Symmetry: C2
């Protein structure tokens, strides 16, 4: 038997936690990195993405709405059938890409509201559904940030009720709420209280990674994450670089997603424990070592820097495929070392060792 | 203005010759190697084959008859349009693959005769047409070899007349006759006299490279090639390994074709000036040198043994493409060094240097 959504914390160190989310389509090890998915020849195969270590992938609701459309994905059997991925899928609400009519009802651009966003995510058949919120701009006036937070909370309630109105969705999926409030601690507290009063399966910290820089993002995390319910997962959306991830786990974040491994891989850039490298650099043309000396991904078991350099410089799509697979696998190995070090009570030392070497 | 078929000898050394065949679709430098073509994603691009140095490619009439068929190729505009190759094309008669009813009329298996073979080659629109002959088996009884030679000469006359009956073919293409007679000098002489009496644009030495070994092939060439008209091209069909080619040029052969560069490339084997190599061998996994140290093909300008080794071992089709391109380019560079050394009167020394190093 498998539960709808069950978060268990197995070990803690400071604010960091490691554990599992059990869902009907599988178990998610936390802290978790979710690669951002696309349709299943122009992308990695889903078995390849699974083999990198990913327990869950993300679907971009806005892009799926535009092509091929949510009703079409439903007729094809849902997003799992469409993507060839049978493990859990999280979908965002589509609201951020709308920004990236505009009344309290929702927006038209296609129409999106709390109710329509929840309905589209049900048509996709995703396992974790994000509430529809309003993104405060960056930077945000204290006036504008107060406005978008309060609208987001009324929309979070509407998301809650829309989700609960479909037995098939409410019995089989989970719903996450999104805290807003920008850099204003009192707003963040009001937002957290509102979401906790409504009740969600997990809570995301919104309004971050939108240009504010890491020091400010960390300062906001420092007081925002403790406000959320301790016994539910904490999600930092769209983050990020490896050092962003490590420091966010130090501050209590359990879940992450980012296109960065894919964007980097397509641009000829590989993540390594010694920092990112540009594989086109001449120093790699005769380098017989793998992309990363310690990475145990399938690419680093077989391919040298020299030969990936050759593929990338020739514009062979295989080069970008190999880079992307390694980058996503590197991210999963980072999450695994994070999980292991929390379990063994040496995560704070892991983070310091990681930073000293990554920025050396 | 461009002539139908004009063979000019520019320089000689012993029995070896170098020169040009001018045809309406281009000039063929001799001695020439003709790669064996196929349809134009599962093959090298025709611009790639041209860039290796090939002046003319071969079409396999029997395979083209079976798929998509000669009438279909004609409706598509002919073999040049079908293959994306606008330079000269030679077609064989289809008769050897028939072996590899059977009366004096021809054969049924589809039907092939001197007349039908010439007609199919006209439908293909090829520039050099081979007469239809009868292949004596290997090894051949002195009885069987006498029979197949004499039938071939009657069929050579029928080929001549069929070709001459179509103004469009006779004014724009050329026709080659094929000497037969197996290892019997008197038969070879009878065959040569018959073909010279009929008259052809060029003459092939048939019945060789069918299992007899190089020493016997060379012994037959020694007396067979001098029997053919000196002022027309001499063609040794389906030959062969680099050392076969060098020794055949020493004996007066001007033209060659072989699937060997392609078959080798698909099997992970590369020709080099130091002999062929099996790129899968472990010694190449860290070898940063190109396939051949002196080859100036596009592959050796960019790719290392190590990375082609990696591609081949992974089963990436790019690996086989690169190997095949290099092998066909290596063959063209061999022909160019042959042509250059004859022009400079140092071909006999070239051949000895070539053998000492290729078999070292
Ligand atoms: Zn790797
Ligand atoms: Zn080469």
């Amino acid at each position: 038997d498998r539960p709808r959504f069950s978060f268990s914390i197995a070990a803690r160190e400071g604010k960091a936690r490691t554990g599992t989310i059990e869902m009907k389509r599988g178990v998610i090890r936390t802290p978790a990195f979710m690669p951002v998915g696309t349709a299943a020849v122009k992308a990695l195969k889903p078995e390849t993405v699974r083999a990198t270590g990913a327990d869950i992938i993300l679907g971009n609701t806005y892009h799926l709405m535009l092509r091929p459309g949510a009703e079409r994905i439903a007729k094809l059997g849902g997003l799992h059938s469409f993507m060839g991925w049978d493990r859990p899928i999280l979908t965002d609400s589509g609201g951020y890409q709308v920004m990236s009519k505009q009344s309290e009802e929702g927006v038209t651009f296609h129409m999106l509201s709390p109710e329509r966003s929840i309905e589209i995510q049900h048509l996709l058949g995703s396992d974790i559904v994000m509430a529809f919120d309003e993104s405060t701009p960056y930077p945000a006036t204290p006036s504008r940030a107060a406005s978008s937070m309060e609208r987001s909370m009324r929309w979070a309630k509407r998301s809650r009720d829309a989700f609960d109105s479909r037995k098939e969705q409410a019995e089989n999926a989970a719903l996450f709420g999104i805290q807003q409030g920008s850099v204003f601690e009192n707003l963040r507290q009001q937002s957290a209280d509102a979401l906790a009063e409504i009740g969600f399966d997990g809570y995301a910290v919104g309004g971050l990674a939108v240009g504010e820089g890491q020091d400010e993002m960390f300062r906001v995390l420092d007081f925002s994450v403790p406000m959320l319910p301790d016994d539910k997962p904490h999600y930092l959306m769209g983050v990020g670089k490896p050092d962003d991830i490590v420091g966010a786990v130090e501050r209590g974040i359990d879940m992450f997603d980012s296109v960065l491994p894919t964007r980097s891989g397509r641009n000829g850039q590989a993540f390594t424990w010694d920092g990112p490298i540009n594989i086109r650099n001449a120093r790699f043309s005769e380098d017989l070592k793998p992309l990363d000396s310690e990475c145990h991904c399938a690419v680093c078991q077989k391919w040298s820097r020299a030969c990936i350099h050759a593929l990338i410089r020739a514009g062979e799509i295989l080069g970008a495929m190999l880079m992307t697979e390694h980058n996503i696998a590197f991210y999963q190995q980072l999450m695994q070392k994070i999980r292991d070090s929390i379990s063994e009570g040496r995560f704070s030392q892991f983070a310091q060792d990681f930073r000293a070497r990554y920025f050396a």
